UniProtKB/Swiss-Prot annotation, chain A:
Coiled coil: none
Protein name: Uncharacterized protein MG376 homolog
Source organism per UniProt: Mycoplasma pneumoniae (strain ATCC 29342 / M129 / Subtype 1) (Mycoplasmoides pneumoniae)
Alphabetized InterPro entries for the sequence: DUF3217, NA-bd_OB-fold
Length: 98, 104
């Protein structure tokens, strides 16, 4: 069904899967809401060839803007259902969206 | 910051915070894993007028589609930052949505 996410954030860290099947990148969104600042952390990822385009952006830019779908998965020897974004398209940092 | 989410699923459960500052709903979206049909669960919420719209849409429909903002909070234990969607807009369960973007 319907599932589209447009997210942009600052790159905090990133690494490969165990099998190095996919590249996970943690992005951060930090902002003032009321009298206080709230900071959000998101784990987006890419598989296949796209995991290399993702990893290169990591080496090039401090911020990333992507397109993708919301997903969750169960961490085995970890017990937890984690939420993440699977990337569909990375954007040109020098370009806006709308 | 670029932050927009469009999602739809089946309402699984929901509840009001203490001073009813907001209304929280938990949605299920079908997922596959090879040939196995499984499920994805998401937590969405709303404030003010829209919290009351949510609770009503909740006591009237099984599925729900929305437009929202992806947020997170810290699970101080597992130190995992959990994800929640701040509802911005609720759609008519009779309407086909349809997204796209530009590239200025």
């Amino acid at each position: 069904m319907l599932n589209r996410v447009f997210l942009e954030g600052e790159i905090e860290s990133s690494c490969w899967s165990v099998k190095k099947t996919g590249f996970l990148v943690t992005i951060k969104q930090m902002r003032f809401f009321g009298e206080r600042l709230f900071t959000d952390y998101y784990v987006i990822y890419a598989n296949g060839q796209l995991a290399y385009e993702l990893e290169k952006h990591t080496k090039k830019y401090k911020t990333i803007s992507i397109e993708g779908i919301l997903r969750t998965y169960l961490e085995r020897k970890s017990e937890i259902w984690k939420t993440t974004i699977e990337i569909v398209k990375i954007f040109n940092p020098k370009n806006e969206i709308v």
